Each structure stands twice: as C-alpha cells, then as structure tokens.
C-alpha cells in the first residue's frame, strides 16, 4: 500500500485509545 | 523537564530536605536523649551521551 496511490478497499478506521485496552 | 529545570529542581528539593533536617535538629534541643540527624546526599546515575 504505497501512500498517495489508489486502492479498491477503503482505509481502515483509525483509533486513538488513551490507555492500553 | 528540559533536563536543566529538572536537575536544578532536584537540587532545590535536596537543599529543602537538608533545611528540614536542620530545623528538626534545632527544634529538639531541649528533649532528653535526642540524637542529632545528619543528611547524606548522593548523585544519581550520570548519563553518557557519547563515548570518549
């Protein structure tokens, strides 16, 4: 997955969890 | 914590602790069988940034 390219599949949703779990 | 505001804070705390020890020694002058305290300090781990 080269950045700036085009891919058929959507990007996975990002997450920023403050603690570990 | 810029590594110079922490190092000097540590020294300030050490001097405050020594002053607390001195004040405790002075306040307990009139007590019976009181042994005076003495504060001992040691430097912590020195960090090596680049070898000689």
């Amino acid at each position: 997955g080269v950045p700036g390219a085009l891919s058929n599949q959507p990007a996975p949703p990002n997450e920023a969890p403050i603690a570990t779990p | 914590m810029i590594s110079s505001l922490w190092i000097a804070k540590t020294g300030l705390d050490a001097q405050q602790t020594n002053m607390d020890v001195i004040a405790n020694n002075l306040a307990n002058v009139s007590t019976n069988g009181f042994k005076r305290q003495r504060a001992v300090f040691e430097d912590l781990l020195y960090q090596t940034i680049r070898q000689p």
Binding site: - | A14, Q15, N18, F41, E42, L45, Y46
Partner: protein, 250 residues
C-alpha cells in the same frame, strides 16, 4: 534551507547540554566527596569541497575536577578524609573495584564496612569488623576494634584500608559515579592499583563537594548569553530564507 541555521541550532542545543551539566554540578553542592564535572565546548570543522566555512560545536566533558573540597569536622571516628591525590577503594556494583572520596564509612549489623552501600576494600578483600564493636581508624588506614564490655586494653588492629594514588588524567567517572582507571592508565599501572604507603587519611573529618560557585555562576551567565546569540542567527536565517524563496516566483 541555508544550513547556517543547523550550526546555530547545534550551538544552542549544546549550550543546553552544558547548562544541564552545570545544574547537575550545582545540585550536588552538598554531596560528601563529590568531584565536579568539567564542561568544555569543542569545535569540529566539517570537511569537504569548497570554502571550509562550516564549523559546528559540540559539548565535551574532559574528566572531572580533582581539587580537594571542604573538610567538615564531624566528631565521628568512622568518617575519614583522604590526603589530596588520594582515593579510597570500594567494590563496585558489578563486583569490580572502584575508587571514591566519600569517607562516610558505615558498619552493618553483620559487621561489614560499607560506603554508600558498596563494600569497603581492605588490604585483602572486603573488611569485616567484629559485630557491634567500636572502630578507630589510624592515619595510615589501620583499623582498631574495641569490643564493648571488654577493657580498653583489648584494642587490636583488624584490617587496613586500601588507599591508592591517582591523578585526574588517569581516572574516569563511570556511570554510577565511581571512578575507574582509564584504558591507557590501566595498561601501564595494571588492572588493580597497588596501595601507596605514603597516603595519609584523617579520622573525624568528612570531605565535601568541590563545586566552585563563582565558576558556576559565570558559566550560567555566559551560557544564557550564548544561547540568545545563537537564537538571533536562527531568526536571521529564517527571514532571509523566507525572502529568498520569492526568486522562485514568476
């Protein structure tokens, strides 16, 4: 960019390193038997083609200061101070042999002598004192132990402290604060330093830290001024580039 910003930035960061060294020295102004660290800037010129115009700066700690500090008179027979150019020998953290100036010798319940928690090294390996006995230390390091209850006639020598002679150019401060012989000095003087019979210790006096206050103050003033100077250049270069980028227009 113009890499002139990367010169003043280095000069500003090494100034903060020097300030961190000086503040560390100032924090230990009361540490018993402390050797202040020397700080010095050194210039490294970048080699390559064309006008050798760039010379960066990098801090440097050339050993430590071996000037003896203050001697506080504490009427305690265990606190000893060493003659100038002298060192006490203790067992380091990793079972090795290290050197120190802190004479705050403590006696454990089992009877072993310690300095800052490190065992004290006597003429023959660590020193074990008879349990719960009064200790007197002679001028040449001989240790006399008096067992409580028995008369003062019982006082007899037990062991001799190992006292070594080493200059500043031969020793290097390890990461735990204990000095050890440098490579060149170790190769010539051997692995273990032989005890010098001429060294004299004083019992009942504790050596303080040799952190000179006037030099520290002057160093902080100079460091602040140098940092502000480098910051001026860091601002000059920024504006110059901001304007030079216009030539790329039209």
């Amino acid at each position: 960019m113009d890499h002139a910003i990367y010169t003043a930035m280095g000069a500003a960061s090494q100034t903060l390193n020097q300030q961190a060294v000086t503040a560390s020295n100032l924090a230990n102004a009361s540490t018993p038997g402390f050797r202040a660290q020397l700080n010095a800037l050194r210039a490294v010129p970048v080699d390559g083609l064309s006008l050798a115009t760039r010379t960066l700066v990098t801090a440097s700690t050339p050993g430590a200061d071996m000037t003896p500090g203050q001697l506080d008179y504490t009427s305690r027979p265990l606190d000893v101070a060493l003659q100038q150019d002298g060192w006490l020998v203790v067992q380091a953290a990793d079972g090795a042999e290290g050197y120190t100036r802190n004479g705050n010798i403590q006696v454990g319940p089992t009877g072993q002598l310690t300095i800052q928690g490190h065992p004290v090294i006597g003429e023959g390996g660590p020193i074990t004192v008879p349990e719960g006995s009064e200790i007197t230390i002679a001028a040449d390091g001989t240790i006399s132990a008096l067992n409580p209850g028995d008369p003062p006639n019982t006082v007899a020598p037990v062991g001799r402290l190992k006292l070594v002679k080493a200059e500043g150019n031969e020793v290097q401060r390890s990461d735990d604060g204990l000095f050890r012989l440098t490579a060149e000095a170790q190769a010539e003087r051997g692995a273990v330093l032989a005890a010098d019979p001429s060294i004299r210790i004083m019992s009942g006096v504790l050596e303080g830290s040799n952190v000179k206050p006037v030099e520290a103050m002057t160093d902080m003033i100079a460091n602040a001024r140098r940092f502000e100077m480098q910051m001026k250049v860091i601002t000059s270069v920024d504006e110059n580039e901001g304007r030079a980028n216009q030539l790329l227009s039209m």
